[PDB]
Paper text:
Photosystem II (PSII) produces dioxygen by extracting electrons and protons from water, which takes place at the oxygen-evolving complex (OEC), an oxo-bridged Mn4CaO5 cluster with a shape that resembles a distorted chair. In conjunction with the oxidation of the OEC, protons are released in a 1:0:1:2 stoichiometry for the S0–S1, S1–S2, S2–S3 and S3–(S4)–S0 transitions, and two water molecules are split to produce a dioxygen in the S3–(S4)–S0 transition, after which the OEC returns to its most reduced S0 state. Here we use pump-probe serial femtosecond crystallography to reveal the structural dynamics of PSII from nanoseconds to milliseconds after illumination with one flash (1F) or two flashes (2F). We identify structural changes associated with electron transfer, proton release and water delivery at various regions, including QA–QB, YZ, the OEC and the O1, O4 and Cl-1 channels.
Large difference densities appear on the QA side at Δt1 = 20 ns and Δt1 = 200 ns, become weak at Δt1 = 1 µs to Δt1 = 200 µs and vanish at Δt1 = 5 ms. These changes correspond to the formation of QA−, the oxidation of QA− to QA and the completion of QA− oxidation, respectively. The formation of QA− causes the counterclockwise rotation of its head group, concomitant with similar rotations or movements of D2-F261, D2-W253 and D2-H214, which surround QA. The formation of QA− also induces a shift of the non-haem iron by about 0.2 Å towards QA. At Δt1 = 20 ns, two negative difference densities first appear adjacent to D1-Q165 and YZ, and at Δt1 = 200 ns, pairs of positive and negative difference densities appear over D1-Q165, YZ and D1-F186, indicating their correlated movements towards P680. These movements might be in preparation for the subsequent electron transfer from YZ to P680. Notable positive difference densities first appear on Mn4 and subsequently cover all four Mn and one Ca ions at Δt1 = 20 ns–200 ns before OEC oxidation. Nevertheless, metal–metal distances remain largely unchanged, suggesting a possible charge rearrangement on the OEC triggered by the electrostatic effect of the oxidized YZ•+/YZ. Difference densities appear at Δt1 = 20 ns on W20, W22 and the nearby D1-D342 main chain; these are likely to be induced by correlated movements of the neighbouring YZ and D1-Q165. The difference densities near Cl-1 are observed when YZ is oxidized to YZ•+ at Δt1 = 20 ns.
Author numbering:
A (entry chain V): 1 to 137
B (entry chain C): 23 to 473
C (entry chain E): 4 to 84
D (entry chain A): 11 to 344
E (entry chain D): 11 to 352
F (entry chain I): 1 to 38
């Protein structure tokens, strides 16, 4: 098995446009995810709130949908609760809250795309392991 | 080659440094060269830390143990422990590194070039281990030096910028200490606290006024005793109780260092005042309490009445009573209810955690701080996979508190072994049987049989 | 002593090092090339990183018969496209 | 000859059947207290709420235990590291419920055993011996400190101290593997080499000396009567032993110096057990064994399992089942 | 009669740097091949087709995780000869099917026989009693019971220990979860023998070193000993008085002392071997029936015995699907035993 | 419980003093060889 362009092709937006990441983007997304996100999200779960995971099926049913690049990039700028009703920048890392989450200060727009691409590609590789927790270790 | 082989000295090569016992000049060289190594490491390690340091990451995510020591003293940091200026870290490293060349130079000179013995050269720098007067005088000088060192910390705190105060109103900040605690009932009352849970002996010091005032007392005490030991000679009761020899003196210091290493191990594990969690990461108690707080907050936001939620055991799922009645966090963290920290004390009332404050006054910065500390608990593998032993690879993390506590327990243990080794040997050498039993004089042969 | 030349004699002799300054690196380089040419994989039947699985499968090619085990492995190897 | 000097001369006398000495003055009462409490508690103590969840565990013989399952149960998790002498309880019945006896036993035992180590130094001084037998005893002594005191301190509770029982020991070991992966820690591995090697060199030295006993007896009598207590001459031929063992391996792999041979016999297990003690003592601060979970990844990024991942599955099973009612939140952080 | 047999005997028994002997004809090829097979396998050979595991340096494993793994369960107890009906002479297939495991195990068994014959042979030539060989029966009993008898009682070689560090750790944990092996009194005796032997090693070595006679002037006491001296180098009388007054009892017979040091670890290993023979048949010390009857009926009855069985139950359910891939266990999340929260 | 506490405090203090005064009582000289150690 190989990391092919098929694997690296993910939804860009809700209208069905796709974008194909490079292997360098994917690996950059993994490094930046570890840098800024894995302390709570290792393996696609959420340690401080295990009810919400990073499975694509879970992201598809968020409001607004987060199962694509634009939704995930928007989440990292201005995160909301699962139903979209509330803005949680004050307790979740984002560009809007880079003053209180200093690791977000040196993330650029290009970095957000790569992190987003990692989150969308990893389940295509790991299957149930992604967001499955210890049962699938 | 004076005393530089086994036949002349009686010591094999693997005990070669024992050949130095009565060669004060080379022994001086060895000690000065070695201090140069200590100062070298401090300087070089700091520079390595600085080169590898990203100011946007918490120190505790970066494998730093020296910069946190400097930051705690009030250099380079501002409110909340944010790094505002890395130049002080640079200075501290460079100056230690440059100084190590001076110490290395003197050490190499005295070790191989200078006079091997100092008694012929200078009666002031010369010494005999058995001269109780000279030994207490040398001890007296070094007590005065140590006492000055303690007063430098006071001067830093009161006159040269202050100290980083994790408890400062508004999130932690550098603060000048204007009223150090001088009341000896407070300062010495720390020494008589039990070392067990909820008391914690001196590890429990929780405010900078006590820290600074304790160093004033220690500075004076060391200077006074240093003068005392210059002017006096050991009394008769002391003379009869001790062994007076180089190895014996070494053994006493090994005992002392082992004890200090064990205390340092607990200090860094439990204390979050002189080891601020901003720089070192949360303590183990702290991260465990932070998890209870995180899920209390999450569930209360979902509509749970956390005060009346009965857990599976019948004890409260979120809150319960300590054995003396205080309201505390539930679950396995019941063991950690003695934890105090700036992010938690606003919820504390006279009876412990206050349900009204919990319901109404939890600020977003507290939720942030608890989620950060819960996810940087001091658990991790030897290859620096952060988390419980069953976690997958992803997070490269081992808390500085674990690094500092494990290393100093190991060092303290071996220094206790060294004390036993050298105290037992000093006693035997003084009495004259450290090389074996004299066949013609075997003591047990002159004793009555046991039965 | 048992008659053989002492080891300390041999390994401080120029002739020993004239010989072994060649034979030691030559063996090392042969071992390096055994891997770098990919020959080790084929001698022993060890998967390369891209041959543990087919592109979309997640099942192990586990041997399940005693006397057709050889053919089972060959069949698993075909199915790698 | 005043009464204090008389007392000191009796205390330090080399003529007592059992040496007392100054360490013995602390040793004797603390070991007696710990022994008496242990025996009574092992037989008759009521169940103990070890994990603080009002779920008492029965440890004594009268309450349904045999020799293998019985234990003196660690004190309650609700107490953590607080000091719990009898006089801090409102009654003996409270003290028993909360595992009071555990604290009394281990504190008196650790004091008594530290003084046992001092007593070994002390008698060697009175007899004109070299001083370091007590340094060998520091290795088992450090190990007891590791499981009764140091590990409780790092984890914040004497309830995670080792129970004083056979099956209690096994419980402690299994949970330790789940929470620290001790099998993958090099200090436990050095400890295994210490005690495996200690047992190997024990049988080795025993077999070699026994193999080279000098014929002094007939076949109908025990060869042990060929040695006489106090005799001046060695009872075996070390040259024949060295000649056998040097040929078994090669000549330079064998000892012909009895003094360095016996030093090696002392050092190997003592150093290994030191490392074992330090493993427990440093995993007390959660610096755990090597973690290679999902370390091997294929070209696509599939996880390729190693034996390390199979170990992890076993550790998870121990993790999720231990103390099954004691955790309300998803991470077992202590 | 000085025929070829006696001339060969002459050459085999020459006093050389490495003694050879008749025993050496068995010992050296078998020991060399078992070691060479382990190094070859841990460096280059996979366990993908037998276990679903990477297991070689080539694949990225390290010293702790490499192994030569057991064959697949479907091989049964096949000798797995290179020329046998499974591999059929194909060296690559043989490696993939687990032929290196039986190769190492069988050459290792015969190497161990050869080492023990070497101990007899050299002892007979030098003129010493053969107690070193007798003591070596204990490592042989352990090797044969764990690597041969145990899997022969089970379904296949697959359940034997695999030859690697972490693979052996998995073997320890399997024995706790499935066999409750810590509860077994034959293991308990083995533990006593091994820890007691380590204890005797430490205490005897320390006692000799601290009752030495001053037989020289140096502070390094090692030089003051001559292998041909007739005198004891340490005081048995002083040693005996020390331990009598510290511990109550002491050795007084030096021959008994060194026989005892042989006896204790050798007997311990032999006892552990017997219990493992029982486990070959699943004849475990798993339960105490009296405890189970009480606990079934009285849901307030809890002991460290019942606590450990719950741990075993966790080990079995959580490790079995990955550890026994040929069984095809599919355990949905909802059937997995778990405590609260974890 | 208070009587128990005072008793233990007194007992422990008694044995500790014996230990300290014991080793203060010329202990280096209590060996079979050289007494003159001071
Ligand atoms: C000469 C020798 C004479 C011997 C004298 C014998 C007398 C008794 C000996 C001491 C026995 C100690 C047992 C309990 C140790 C312990 O619970 O230690 C813990 C304490 C610290 O206590 C903790 O201190 C904490 C203080 O923190 C508090 O204050 C902080 C302020 O920042 C934080 O806010 C924190 O959140 C808050 O809780 C809390 O009170 C905790 O509840 C409390 O448990 O350490 C301390 O007192 C200091 C460290 C003590 C040394 C540690 C012992 C190690 C011994 C190793 C021996 C190895 C031998 C090998 C043999 C070979
Ligand atoms: C002491 C110092 C010694 C020094 C070391 C010496 C090393 C020498 C090396 C010798 C190695 C011997 C290998 C034996 C392999 C074996 O046994 O292989 C096993 C085969 C039997 O094969 C097994 O048979 C089983 C039962 O099948 C039977 O039942 C099936 C189900 O109903 C079907 O009907 C099937 O057709 C039928 O054959 C299963 O099929 C298994 O998968 C299959 O492996 O026996 C056989 O080869 C022969 C069996 C008879 C001889 C057994 C004596 C030797 C073993 C003693 C150990 C006792 C262990 C019992 C537990 C305790
Ligand atoms: C911190 C570690 C340390 C220090 C400071 C010393 C110091 C000393 N050792 Mg000890 N020793 C040590 C560790 C140390 N040792 C260790 C680990 C072992 C076991 C191997 C020994 C075993 C041992 C034996 C057997 C002996 C000593 C002896 C000595 C003394 C004389 C050495 C000599 O004459 O060499 C001469 C060597 C040289 C001239 C070669 C180079 C030496 C220089 C100093 C190298 C320094 C390089 C440095 C980069 C230059 C910086 C210059 C710059 C600052 C300007 C000296 C005071 C001797 C002694 O006791 O004499 C009475 C002796 O016989 N040692
Ligand atoms: C300030 C601390 C201190 C000082 C000044 C001394 C001084 C001395 N010791 Mg003592 N000792 C100490 C602490 C100290 N010791 C401790 C903490 C222990 C317990 C381990 C000992 C145990 C001990 C024993 C058993 C003996 C001494 C002896 C001696 C004398 C000869 C030392 C020598 O030449 O070693 C030479 C140095 C070496 C041979 C090198 C040792 C190498 C170490 C083990 C490597 C450790 C690994 C390292 C930390 C990390 C790995 C590095 C690697 C990756 C490169 C000398 C008076 C001897 C004596 O009694 O003489 C009177 C003796 O027999 N010491
Ligand atoms: C007080 C001692 C101490 C402590 C607590 C730390 C802690 C740390 N170091 Mg530092 N460091 C130290 C001393 C220390 N160091 C010394 C002496 C050096 C010079 C060698 C360094 C040079 C250094 C570098 C270059 C780096 C670190 C790094 C780190 C971090 C990662 C450590 C790691 O992964 O270890 C791995 C674990 C081991 C190697 C285990 C060592 C096992 C030893 C050999 C056992 C010894 C036992 C005993 C001493 C011997 C007894 C023998 C017996 C016979 C008596 C961690 C914060 C890393 C970092 O993150 O920097 C920001 C990094 O890159 N350190
Ligand atoms: C504590 C360490 C120490 C001690 C006790 C000594 C002691 C001695 N040295 Mg050595 N030396 C040392 C370290 C030490 N030195 C260092 C670090 C170096 C490199 C600079 C040297 C280089 C050196 C040389 C080249 C010579 C000596 C000589 C001597 C002898 C005569 C010195 C004298 O009379 O000065 C009189 C006192 C003074 C001049 C006062 C000096 C005040 C200093 C420089 C200012 C700082 C004081 C302050 C406390 C420093 C704090 C440092 C701290 C932060 C680390 C004497 C035995 C001489 C000798 O061996 O004769 C044969 C000699 O020729 N030393
Ligand atoms: C490095 C520090 C240091 C060292 C090595 C010494 C060493 C010495 N001092 Mg000096 N002293 C010092 C600092 C030091 N002093 C300081 C800072 C002062 C000013 C306060 C003094 C004031 C002083 C006086 C007035 C006297 C000495 C004396 C002595 C000599 C006898 C020591 C003795 O018997 O202790 C043994 C300790 C005791 C007997 C204390 C009682 C025993 C208790 C019960 C032990 C408790 C241990 C326990 C674990 C404590 C844990 C912490 C605790 C606080 C809770 C010895 C040479 C004596 C001497 O001969 O002077 C010429 C003497 O009369 N010293
Ligand atoms: C005696 C003896 C010994 C020891 C020795 C020693 C221990 C020595 C020491 C030494 C030392 C201790 C030395 C040091 C030196 C130092 C130096 C030489 C430094 C320099 C520095 C510099 C040059 C700097 C630079 C810089 C800067 C300024 C800035 C930043 C960057 C950099 C870093 C580049 C031995 C054991 C061997 C043996 C024999 C005898
Ligand atoms: C700084 C500080 C502080 C303070 C501190 C202090 C004030 C301290 C003190 C300390 C001290 C003050 C200590 C002491 C110690 C002591 C010791 C450690 C002792 C010892 C002793 C000994 C060891 C003895 C011995 C012996 C005996 C017993 C018998 C006879 C003989 C002899 C002598 C051997 C505080 C906490 C506030 C806060 C923080 C900071
Ligand atoms: C199987 C087989 C065979 C055989 C083969 C062989 C015989 C091989 C050999 C092989 C070998 C013979 C190999 C070897 C290798 C080696 C190595 C790989 C080593 C390494 C080492 C190291 C790495 C080291 C390390 C260390 C230590 C351990 C300690 C000290 C320090 C150090 C760090 C140095 C035949 C063909 C018959 C047939 C088919 C099957
Ligand atoms: C809480 C701990 C308090 C520790 C207090 C430390 C204070 C130090 C003062 C110690 C008092 C000096 O008094 C000390 O005791 C008595 C006095 O009868 C003597 O006691 C001893 O003397 C000699 C020592 O050579 C012995 O042979 C003899 O058996 C014994 O009588 C000590 O030699 C003396 O040194
Ligand atoms: C199997 C080996 C049995 C020895 S066989 C023996 O060997 C002799 C050599 O000494 C010959 O002289 C003799 O004819 C032959 O029978
Ligand atoms: Ca003086
Ligand atoms: Cl449990
Ligand atoms: Cl919990
Ligand atoms: Fe012996």
């Amino acid at each position: 098995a190989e990391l092919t362009p098929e694997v690296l092709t993910v939804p860009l937006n809700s209208e069905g446009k796709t974008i194909t990441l490079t292997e360098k983007q994917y690996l950059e997304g993994k490094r930046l995810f570890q840098y800024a996100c894995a302390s709570c999200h290792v393996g696609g779960i959420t340690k401080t709130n295990p009810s919400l995971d990073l499975r694509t099926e879970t992201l598809a049913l968020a409001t607004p949908p987060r199962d694509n690049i634009e939704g995930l990039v928007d989440y990292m700028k201005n995160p909301t609760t699962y139903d979209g009703e509330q803005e949680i920048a004050e307790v979740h890392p984002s560009l809007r809250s880079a003053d209180i989450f200093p690791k977000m200060r040196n993330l650029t727009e290009k970095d957000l795309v790569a992190i987003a691409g990692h989150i969308l590609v990893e389940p295509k590789i790991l299957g149930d392991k992604w967001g499955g927790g210890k049962v699938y270790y | 080659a004076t005393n530089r082989d086994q036949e002349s000295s009686g010591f094999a090569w693997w005990a070669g440094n024992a050949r130095l016992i009565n060669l004060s000049g080379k022994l001086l060289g060895a000690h000065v060269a070695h201090a140069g190594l200590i100062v070298f490491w401090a300087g070089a390690m700091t520079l390595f830390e600085l080169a590898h340091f990203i100011p946007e990451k918490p120190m505790y995510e970066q494998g730093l143990i020296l910069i946190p020591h400097i930051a705690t003293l009030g250099w380079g940091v501002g409110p909340g422990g944010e790094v505002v200026d890395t130049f002080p870290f640079f200075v501290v490293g460079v100056v230690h590194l440059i100084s190590s060349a001076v110490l290395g130079f003197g050490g190499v000179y005295h070790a191989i070039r200078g006079p091997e013995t100092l008694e012929e050269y200078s009666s002031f720098f010369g010494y005999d281990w058995k001269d109780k007067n000279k030994m207490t005088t040398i001890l007296g000088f070094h007590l005065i030096v140590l006492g000055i060192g303690a007063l430098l910390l006071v001067a830093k705190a009161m006159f040269f910028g202050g100290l980083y105060d994790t408890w400062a109103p508004g999130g932690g900040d550098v603060r000048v200490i204007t009223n150090p605690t001088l009341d000896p009932r407070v300062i010495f009352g720390y020494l008589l606290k039990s070392p067990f849970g909820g008391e914690g002996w001196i590890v429990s010091v929780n405010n900078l006024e006590d820290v600074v005032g304790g160093h004033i007392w220690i500075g004076l005490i060391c200077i006074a005793g240093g003068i005392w030991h210059i002017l006096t000679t050991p009394f008769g009761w002391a003379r009869r109780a001790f062994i007076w020899s180089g190895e014996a003196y070494l053994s006493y210091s090994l005992g002392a260092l082992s004890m200090m290493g064990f205390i340092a191990t607990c200090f860094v594990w439990f204390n979050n005042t002189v080891y601020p969690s901003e720089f070192y990461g949360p303590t183990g108690p702290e991260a465990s309490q932070a998890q209870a707080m995180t899920f209390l907050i999450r569930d209360q936001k979902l509509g749970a009445n956390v005060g009346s939620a009965q857990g599976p055991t019948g004890l409260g799922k979120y809150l319960m009573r300590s054995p003396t009645g205080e309201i505390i966090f539930g679950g396995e963290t019941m063991r950690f209810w003695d934890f105090r920290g700036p992010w938690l004390e606003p919820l504390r009332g006279p009876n412990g955690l206050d349900l009204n404050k919990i319901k109404n006054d939890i600020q977003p910065w507290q939720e942030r701080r608890a989620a950060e500390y819960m996810t940087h608990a001091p658990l991790g593998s030897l290859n620096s996979v952060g988390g419980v032993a069953t976690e997958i690879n992803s997070v490269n993390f081992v808390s500085p508190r674990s690094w500092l506590a494990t290393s100093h327990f190991v060092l303290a243990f071996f220094f206790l072994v060294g004390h036993l080794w050298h105290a037992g040997r000093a006693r035997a050498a003084a009495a004259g049987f450290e090389k074996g039993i004299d066949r013609e004089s075997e003591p047990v042969l002159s004793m009555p049989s046991l039965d | 002593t048992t008659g053989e030349r002492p080891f300390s004699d041999i390994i401080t002799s120029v002739r020993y090092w004239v010989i072994h300054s060649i034979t030691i690196p030559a063996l090392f380089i042969a071992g390096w090339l055994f891997v770098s040419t990919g020959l080790a994989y084929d001698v022993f039947g060890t998967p390369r990183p891209d041959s543990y699985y087919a592109q979309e499968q997640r099942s192990i090619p586990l041997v399940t018969d005693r006397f057709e085990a050889k053919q089972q492995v060959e069949t698993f190897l075909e199915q790698l496209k | 000859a005043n009464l204090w000097e008389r007392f000191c001369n009796w205390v330090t006398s080399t003529d007592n059947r059992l040496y007392v000495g100054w360490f013995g003055v602390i040793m004797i009462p603390t070991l007696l207290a710990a022994t008496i409490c242990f025996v009574i508690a092992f037989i008759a103590a009521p169940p103990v709420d070890i994990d603080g969840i009002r779920e008492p565990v029965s440890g004594s013989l009268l309450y349904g235990n045999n020799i293998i399952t019985g234990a003196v149960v660690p004190s309650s998790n609700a107490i953590g590291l607080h000091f719990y002498p009898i006089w801090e309880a409102a009654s003996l019945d409270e003290w028993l419920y909360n595992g009071g006896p555990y604290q009394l036993i281990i504190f008196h035992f650790l004091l008594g055993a530290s003084c046992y180590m001092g007593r070994q130094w002390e008698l060697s001084y009175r007899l004109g011996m070299r001083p370091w037998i007590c340094v060998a005893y520091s290795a088992p002594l450090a190990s007891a400190f590791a499981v009764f005191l140091i590990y409780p301190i790092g984890q914040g509770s004497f309830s995670d101290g080792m129970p004083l029982g056979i099956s209690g020991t096994f419980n402690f070991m299994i949970v330790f593997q789940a929470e620290h992966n001790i099998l993958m820690h090099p200090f436990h591995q050095l400890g295994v080499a210490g005690v495996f090697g200690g047992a190997l060199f024990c049988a080795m030295h025993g077999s070699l000396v026994t193999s080279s006993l000098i014929r002094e007896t007939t076949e109908t009598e025990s060869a042990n009567y060929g040695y006489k207590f106090g005799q001046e001459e060695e009872t075996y031929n070390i040259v024949a032993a060295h000649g056998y063992f040097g040929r078994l391996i090669f000549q330079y792999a064998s000892f012909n110096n009895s003094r360095s041979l016996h030093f090696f016999l002392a050092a190997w297990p003592v150093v290994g057990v030191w490392f074992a003690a330090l493993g427990i003592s440093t995993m007390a601060f959660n610096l755990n064994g090597f973690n290679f979970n999902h370390s091997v990844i294929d070209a696509k990024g599939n996880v390729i399992n190693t034996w390390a991942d199979i170990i992890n599955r076993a550790n998870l099973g121990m993790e999720v089942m231990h103390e099954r009612n004691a955790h309300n939140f998803p991470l077992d952080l202590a | 009669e000085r025929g070829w047999f006696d001339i060969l005997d002459d050459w085999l028994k020459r006093d050389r740097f490495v003694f050879v002997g008749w025993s050496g004809i068995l010992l050296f090829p078998c020991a060399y091949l078992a070691l060479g097979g382990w190094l070859t396998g841990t460096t280059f050979v996979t366990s993908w087709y037998t276990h679903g595991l990477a297991s070689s340096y080539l694949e990225g494993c390290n010293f702790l995780t490499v192994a030569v793994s057991t064959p697949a369960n479907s091989m049964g107890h096949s000798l797995l000869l290179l020329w046998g009906p499974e591999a059929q002479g194909d060296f690559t297939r043989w490696c993939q099917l687990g032929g290196l495991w039986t190769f190492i195990a069988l050459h290792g068994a015969f190497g161990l026989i050869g080492f023990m014959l070497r101990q007899f042979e050299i002892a007979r030539l030098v003129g010493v009693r053969p107690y070193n060989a007798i003591a070596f029966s204990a490592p042989i009993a352990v090797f044969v019971s764990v690597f041969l008898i145990y899997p022969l009682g089970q379904s296949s070689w697959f359940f034997a220990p695999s030859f690697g560090v972490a693979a052996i750790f998995r073997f320890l944990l399997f024995f706790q979860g499935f066999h409750n092996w810590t509860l077994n009194p034959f293991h308990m005796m083995g533990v006593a023998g091994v820890l007691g032997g380590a204890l005797l090693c430490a205490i005897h070595g320390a006692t000799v070193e601290n009752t030495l006679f001053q037989d020289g002037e140096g502070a390094s006491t090692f030089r003051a000993f001559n292998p041909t001296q007739a005198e004891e180098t340490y005081s048995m009388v002083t040693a005996n008085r020390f331990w009598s007054q510290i511990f109550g009892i002491a050795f007084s017979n030096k021959r008994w002392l060194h026989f005892f040091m042989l006896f204790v670890p050798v007997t311990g290993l032999w006892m552990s071997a017997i219990g493992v023979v029982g486990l070959a048949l699943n004849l475990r010390s798993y339960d105490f029936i009296s405890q189970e009857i009480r606990a079934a009926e009285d849901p307030e009855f809890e002991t460290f015995y019942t606590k450990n069985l719950l741990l075993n139950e966790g080990i079995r359910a959580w490790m079995a699907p990955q550890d026994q891939p040929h069984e095809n266990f599919v355990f949905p999340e909802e059937v997995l035993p778990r405590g609260n929260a974890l | 419980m208070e009587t128990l506490k005072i008793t233990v405090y007194i007992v422990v203090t008694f044995f500790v003093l014996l230990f300290v005064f014991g080793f203060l009582s010329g202990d280096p000289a209590r060996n079979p060889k050289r007494k003159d150690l001071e």
